[PDB]
């Protein structure tokens, strides 16, 4: 059945960040000595994962309590566990975790492994006991208190017998990337042995798939089953558990991103580069290499997006006259004047329309001026700004600092118009050129024979205040 423990008290958790972890084999092919660009669900590089200690001591006395809160599930979960006594045992998945909706269950029962999908009646605090005493023969007698009952189960599984917990720093890492797509339960998994650690360390480990489960249920929330080393009837304070819950687990949530994976000759994924993390990483992804030489490279195109859409049909009459809400100017918006649709910034114009004219076209391809139906103020439209983005870098293996040149635009509009990496536009390092706006480089009055040609008589170079400087080229 079920047993009620004490309240979780909503403890404020520490956080840690996963330095380049949790990339798995996306496809089912064998690729050797290739650099492949894969767009799929991955855990972002250098992302914050939240880590729970298995058993926390709210006081050093021995006041020990579980940390197994229910957590969301949006398009996959990277779950790592660092532990040495199989204190974590499995997971439940579902939407409501009650009798209303189907629920899936993976758990290690002592020695066997059982997977089910039923209408389990999960209570609030599932736990698996394993206590011992020297007298008689107990040696982890156990209690299995996960679900009250199960009805008309569809998927069944059991495995074979095995071993249990111990009645010492070789903590093992176990990583899983549970994702549910197309009514499946892709469980990418990998075990590794590590020693002399306290948290999850920086490292790289490609994860290989383990099993696909044909399940086909709606999944939104999941929990974690923890092995208890005690008994609620006679709960001990200290040394009852495993060193005050040093074993712990980390949760992070996948996002749809593009990665550059480096398959070595053997077909084993060795390195990865996250495109959307840095300007330098986008340069690597566009050049399809892990090292880039000195120069400037055009990565992508920056375009101002229309903020809000406005309409302006109101002729005033006949048929059904409509309304236009309001009118906004000096702002890049989507506009529909009497059915003429487009995007642009509307501004007050000094052109003088003849009384019988509606719109003008000085360029012969685009109507640069328009007459407003409500008030006869004549508005000229200008296309929202855009331009290429060039990444100025010295040698990739000299330094990882780069500068960014937005070509052919003023940069009173760069930080907000575009939505990846963020600039924050420090006041001193947004030097303006004729060729565009420069971000991440300072100004130097001195002149040198110019290394990297930026344009309009400005060239940039590297000096050990940002490491990259821009100056006006000298002729000798």
């Amino acid at each position, epitope marked *: 059945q079920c047993v009620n423990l004490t309240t979780r008290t909503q403890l*404020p958790p*520490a*956080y*840690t*960040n996963s*330095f380049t972890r949790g990339v798995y084999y996306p496809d089912k092919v064998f690729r050797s000595s290739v650099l492949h660009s894969t767009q799929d669900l991955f855990l972002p590089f*250098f992302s*914050n994962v939240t880590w729970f200690h298995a058993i926390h001591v709210s006081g050093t006395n021995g006041t020990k309590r579980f940390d197994n809160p229910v957590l969301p599930f949006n398009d996959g979960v990277y779950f790592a566990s660092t532990e040495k006594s199989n204190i974590i045992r499995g997971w439940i998945f579902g939407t409501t975790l009650d009798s209303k909706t189907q629920s899936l269950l993976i758990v290690n029962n002592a020695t066997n492994v059982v997977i089910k999908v039923c209408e389990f009646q999960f209570c609030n605090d599932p736990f698996l006991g394993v206590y011992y005493h020297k007298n008689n023969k107990s040696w982890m007698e156990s209690e299995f208190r996960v679900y009250s009952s199960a009805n008309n189960c569809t998927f069944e599984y059991v495995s074979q017998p095995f071993l249990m917990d111990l009645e010492g720093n070789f903590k093992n890492l176990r990583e899983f990337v549970f994702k549910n797509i197309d009514g499946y339960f892709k469980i990418y998994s990998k075990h590794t042995p590590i020693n002399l650690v306290r948290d999850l360390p*920086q490292g790289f480990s490609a994860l290989e798939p383990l099993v696909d489960l044909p399940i086909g249920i709606n999944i939104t929330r999941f929990q974690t089953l923890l092995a208890l080393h005690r008994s609620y009837l006679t709960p001990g304070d200290s040394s009852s558990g495993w060193t005050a819950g040093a074993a712990a687990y980390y949760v992070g949530y996948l996002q749809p991103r593009t990665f550059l994976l480096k398959y070595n000759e053997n077909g084993t994924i060795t390195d990865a580069v996250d495109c959307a993390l*840095d*300007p*330098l990483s986008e340069t690597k992804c566009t050049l399809k290499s892990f090292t880039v030489e000195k120069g400037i490279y055009q990565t992508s195109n920056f375009r101002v997006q229309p903020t809000e859409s406005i309409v302006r049909f109101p002729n005033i009459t006949v048929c059904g006259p409509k309304k236009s809400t309001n009118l906004v100017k000096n702002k890049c918006v989507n506009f529909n004047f009497n059915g003429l649709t487009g995007t642009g910034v509307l501004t007050e114009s000094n052109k003088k329309f003849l009384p019988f004219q509606q719109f003008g076209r000085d360029i012969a391809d685009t109507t640069d001026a328009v007459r407003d139906p409500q008030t006869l103020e004549i508005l000229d439209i200008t296309p929202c700004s855009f331009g290429g983005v060039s990444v100025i870098t010295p040698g990739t293996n000299t330094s*990882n*600092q*780069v*500068a960014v040149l937005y070509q052919g635009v003023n940069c009173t509009e760069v930080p907000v118009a575009i939505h990846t*990496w*963020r600039v*924050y536009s*420090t006041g*001193s*390092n947004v030097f303006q050129t004729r060729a565009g706006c420069l*971000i*991440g480089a300072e100004h130097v009055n001195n002149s040198y024979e110019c290394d990297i040609p930026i344009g309009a008589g400005i060239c940039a170079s590297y000096q050990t*205040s*940002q*490491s990259i400087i821009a100056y006006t080229m000298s002729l000798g």
Partner: nanobody, 113 residues
Framework: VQLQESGGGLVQAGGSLRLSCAASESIFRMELMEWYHQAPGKQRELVAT???????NYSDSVKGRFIISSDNAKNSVYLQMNSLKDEDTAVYSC????????WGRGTQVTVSS
């Protein structure tokens, strides 16, 4: 934004103070960040530095009095001063270098002796 610090002012010799250079961008993506100080009439000199892995370094006049730390619950890097002398009167600045370097404006610290 602004990587701003919040702490400083007038202190008494042998006192203590806390600095809270705090960032909106994630602390872990920094990959290296430090504190420097500019003394009145003296060129700027490094105080202390911490990188992403965990290595921590100080200059000679820094060890044993104030150490560096960063609690991963509010993104911030901490430098609590202990037993200040009159010669630590300076302007303290925190720097954090992502793909480009980011700078704060520092804070005045003056010890009365």
């Amino acid at each position: 934004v602004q990587l701003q610090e919040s702490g400083g002012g007038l202190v008494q010799a042998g006192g203590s103070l806390r600095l809270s250079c705090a960032a909106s961008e994630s602390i872990f993506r920094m990959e290296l960040m430090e504190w420097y100080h500019q003394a009145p009439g003296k060129q700027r000199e490094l105080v202390a530095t911490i990188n992403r892995c965990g290595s921590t370094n100080y200059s000679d006049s820094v060890k044993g009095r104030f150490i560096i730390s960063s609690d991963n619950a509010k993104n911030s890097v901490y430098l609590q001063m202990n037993s200040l002398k009159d010669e630590d009167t300076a302007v303290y600045s925190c720097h954090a270098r992502t793909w480009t370097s980011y700078w704060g404006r520092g804070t005045q610290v003056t010890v009365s002796s």
